[PDB]
């Protein structure tokens, strides 16, 4: 199965740098083409940057060109951006993709990275249990930048788990979790959400009690 | 560049109903190429080269179009094609992408399944109290929410958040908190989480009393 992840996402300072990755594997990676396409938070698709199979040729959108470089390295099976002079338009969930041996789509794509361009600072998030068929909660609140991830004892109870999208106020994102479990799992079963915010390389577990 | 406008911006359709979504480019293109993408996942390959489906891509999926004009078509829609679909272009460089057309699919009207949380005992304990409350998997979108303490409506200092439409059963949620300062939060005794939504007359509503 082909899988391309990409790594390098976060903080990037308006006017600094900041390097991406993407790991290739399950095909060979100097046969093709490969790309870097981005979605800002409006949702738009770009496409930012291309590289030839050997690394010989790129190409690159005119609100990139000057500022970041696509490189390749064929040994390592790793596609990669450099960027630098960071703006506000470069904030993004970038995409490294893959195209196919020829009709110029899109045919493989990344998870995605976030990048955020801000001078704001990087602050961890407060994780809060919701304790009142019972609805349970989590507050995760007061951090930056995005993006955090939350489970609901460990992936486990994914069935039933809605993750709100954060809110932002005052260069700080808030967002809360819910877990609808039978009223015979809680709270006879311990229920635990994990938050983890890599940007302040923070993990925390709160299991929910009742009050 | 050439300029790819999608229309119609949303789609929404009652499974087993035809839509048609239709992606206008700038100038002539000779393919074109159309993705799927749903919250918290990147695109998905769905068309190829205009008509060509992609791996997984069931057959009431077709493509159509030349020229400027091309299309995409769901015969019977169901539940699962809730997403976002996006088209685009390389015939001209640089590729580019149309602003995407969001399909919703309809259902039978439900009721928000509302829950109310009083602050945290750790979030006291910092200075701080927010109240959150959760509305749970209704049809349709469209929700209004006040918040009530002592018997009466505050406004300000209120964050609400939505979901995208459930895959699986079609329905929304919102998430609302009311923050106040742990001084503020303990001169009341009675905070009310009021929805009100088309199905039902009465606003639906739950409450915690600063007592029990
Ligand atoms: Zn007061």
């Known amino acids: 199965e082909v899988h391309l992840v990409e790594s390098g996402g976060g903080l990037g300072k308006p006017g600094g740098s900041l390097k991406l990755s993407c790991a290739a594997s399950?095909?060979?990676?100097?046969?093709?083409?490969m790309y870097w396409v981005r979605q800002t938070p409006e949702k738009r698709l770009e496409w930012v940057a291309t590289?030839?199979?050997?690394?010989?040729?790129?190409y690159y959108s005119d609100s990139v060109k000057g500022r970041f470089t696509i490189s390749r390295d064929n040994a390592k099976n790793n596609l990669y951006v450099q960027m630098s002079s960071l703006k506000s338009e470069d904030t993004a969930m970038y995409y490294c993709?893959?195209?196919?041996?020829?009709?110029?789509?899109?045919?493989?794509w990344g998870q995605g990275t976030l990048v955020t361009v801000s001078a704001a600072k990087t602050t961890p998030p407060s994780v809060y249990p919701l304790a009142p068929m019972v609805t349970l909660g989590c507050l995760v609140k007061g951090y930056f930048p995005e993006p955090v991830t939350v489970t609901w004892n460990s992936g486990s109870l994914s069935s039933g788990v809605h993750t709100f999208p954060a809110v932002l106020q005052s260069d700080l994102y808030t967002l809360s979790s819910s877990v609808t479990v039978p009223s015979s799992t809680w709270p006879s079963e311990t229920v635990t959400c994990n938050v983890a915010h890599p940007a302040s390389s923070t993990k925390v577990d709160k299991k929910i009690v009742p009050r | 560049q050439i300029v790819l406008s999608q229309s119609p911006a949303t789609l929404s359709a009652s499974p087993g109903e035809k839509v048609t979504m239709t992606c206008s480019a700038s100038s002539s293109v000779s393919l074109m190429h159309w993705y799927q993408q749903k919250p918290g996942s990147s695109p998905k390959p769905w068309i190829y080269?205009?008509?060509n489906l992609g791996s997984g891509v069931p057959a009431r999926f077709s493509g159509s179009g030349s020229g400027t004009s091309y299309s995409l078509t769901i015969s019977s829609v169901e539940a699962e094609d809730a997403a976002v679909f996006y088209c685009?272009?390389?015939?001209?460089?640089?590729?580019?992408f149309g602003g995407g057309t969001k399909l919703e699919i309809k259902r039978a009207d439900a009721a928000p399944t509302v829950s109310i949380f009083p602050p945290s005992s750790e979030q006291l304990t910092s200075g701080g109290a927010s109240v959150v409350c959760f509305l749970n998997n209704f049809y349709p979108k469209d929700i209004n929410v006040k918040w009530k303490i002592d018997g009466s409506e505050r406004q300000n200092g209120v964050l609400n958040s939505w979901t995208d439409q459930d895959s699986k059963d079609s329905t929304y949620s919102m998430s609302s908190t009311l923050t106040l300062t742990k001084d503020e939060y303990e001169k009341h005794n009675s905070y009310t989480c009021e929805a009100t939504h088309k199905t039902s007359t009465s606003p639906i509503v739950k409450s915690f009393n600063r007592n029990e």
């Open positions: 399950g095909f060979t990676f100097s046969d093709y083409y």
């Open positions: 080269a205009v008509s």
């Open positions: 993709a893959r195209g196919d041996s020829g009709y110029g789509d899109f045919a493989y």
């Open positions: 685009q272009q390389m015939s001209n460089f640089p590729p580019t």
């Open positions: 590289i030839s199979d050997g690394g010989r040729n790129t």
